[PDB]
Ligand binder design. Structure first.
Ligand SMILES: [Mg+2]
Ligand SMILES: [Mg+2]
Lengths: 174, 174
């Protein structure tokens, strides 16, 4: 299972979401079409399980330092850009396919909750600005994150990005 | 040609980039496979010409009010989300395919120049903060824009976004 997810993350990154064929998946994992669908059912579910893994990892990071720290980590990891692209191929599906949408959102919930807890702790400590509702701050942070993912996925340089993150953090602080 | 571009923008929005078949394109335009490839050569070029149109329109907006105004316009236009998605399907191609990359960047140059001119005028007027290099401000704005495109393309609500834009503008001002 862990073997399947690692290999599949590699396969999706290297070949894309449609290009991630049963053939390619067996090739990346060394397991069969049968033992892959056995755990997960279909491609979409294997995808969501990988998304949920990312979400749980990011959630731990957010707990320590925030969404800005997740973004800092992305600057340190250029090898993961290919996987980030995979993630962006699905957007119309995410927006219009209601069952898929709900599943995507549910698989992200650990992260969404970690971000809410973190911001709550910041507010409780008096560290965020209070002239802007916390929910606007939250949407701003999530927007910057999506921006980072997109730019990095599409081949932008890291340049000035660590300074952009300093600006982003400064923007939400008291 | 104008007939072809309008109809093709509709076809790409409704069916996606791969799903935008010759068959579908003729259907959206009322023109032939031959008269479509005649002007533009292939799908990719018809795509780039549409990207260049978007860039020229955005450039005019930026000239008047900035990138924040482009983003405000996106909140007023939910009908264009489908086209925005099309735009995100290509990301690995944009990042790794060097000829395609260069063509994409060239087709965006009118916008890139409009943003640089606008920021230059802001600086000349003393309206931007000067503790953060202008090029960091520029990357921050472009990051927010990519964020907007992504979030809106993937079915986020507009909620709090107009306030996020107020925050974004306030962040770069003196
Ligand atoms: Mg922080
Ligand atoms: Mg402005």
């Amino acid at each position: 299972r862990q073997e399947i997810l690692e290999g599949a993350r590699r396969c999706f990154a290297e070949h894309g979401y449609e290009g991630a064929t049963v053939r390619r998946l067996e090739e990346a994992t060394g397991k069969s079409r049968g033992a892959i669908f056995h755990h997960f059912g279909d491609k979409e579910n294997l995808f969501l399980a990988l998304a949920r893994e990312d979400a749980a990892r990011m959630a731990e990071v957010v707990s320590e330092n925030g969404l800005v720290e997740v973004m800092r980590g992305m600057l340190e990891d250029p090898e993961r850009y290919d996987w980030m692209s995979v993630r962006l191929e699905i957007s119309k599906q995410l927006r219009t396919d209601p069952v898929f949408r709900a599943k995507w959102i549910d698989h992200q919930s650990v992260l969404d909750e970690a971000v809410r807890v973190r911001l709550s702790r910041n507010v409780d400590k008096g560290q965020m600005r209070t002239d802007v509702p916390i929910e606007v701050l939250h949407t701003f942070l999530e927007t910057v994150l999506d921006g980072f993912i997109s730019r990095l996925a599409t081949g932008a340089s890291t340049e000035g990005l660590s300074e952009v993150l300093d600006l982003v953090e400064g923007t939400v602080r008291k």
